[PDB]
Amino acid sequence: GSHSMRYFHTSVSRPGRGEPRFITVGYVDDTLFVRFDSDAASPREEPRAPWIEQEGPEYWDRETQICKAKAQTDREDLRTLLRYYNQSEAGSHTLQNMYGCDVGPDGRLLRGYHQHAYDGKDYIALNEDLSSWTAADTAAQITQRKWEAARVAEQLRAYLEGECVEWLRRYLENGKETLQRADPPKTHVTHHPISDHEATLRCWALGFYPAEITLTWQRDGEDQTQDTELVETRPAGDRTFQKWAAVVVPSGEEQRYTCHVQHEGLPKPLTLRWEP
């Protein structure tokens, strides 16, 4: 299909309860494969998918070394951000950072990322050109300053174009069994009598990988985009995903409504009616 790799970082200060909490996870598409939790006892980066366990000990020593320095870097940066925003040392704050790449069917870079958030708000981001920044405010302008004078864009760009794509392609081979297989959704239409007057039709999609999926309730072939209830896509817990889409319909006019399922694991988009 189309594939991606991302590393997610959260640092959460907790003044008076030790060092900041640092958790980082790595993903290939919607499969978690590495994790590093600083609150683990003697923390190392650990595997979270079978196709990465094969990497040698040097792989894992290099990953743990990186996670430790990053946790140190966010400890500096968390204090630095308190200066940049004229804040107290009493409070708890959150530094987030995501970076990674997207590749197409060719295996070539579609897009690289590297963006930061502080207390839940965009801070500084590498732009899609991987050579210019977008600073969210006058504090992040201080960083864009420090990062332009270091040619950080040039170095992020070297990573995102080279190694990021290199190793994602590698993982797509080591884990082709699962990373390259799409589990199609199992679909069913349920009918829920709410009262004498109306019943709810729920279009289910279960056990699908990846998470990308589109469920749509059409009335007379026209999308009920406004009056459709649609839950956020949720993890089953065994790597697959679930979602449902529902509409409150009058009893009797049920057969006007069609549910359309779109998922890369399915050959054709599905057309589902409520069938008694």
């Binding site: 990186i66 996670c67 320095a69 630095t80 950080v152 170095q155 990573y159 190694e163």
Partner: peptide, 9 residues
């Protein structure tokens, strides 16, 4: 795998 180098904010 992860990028070797990061930079202080």
């Amino acid at each position: 795998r992860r990028k070797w180098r990061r930079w202080h904010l």
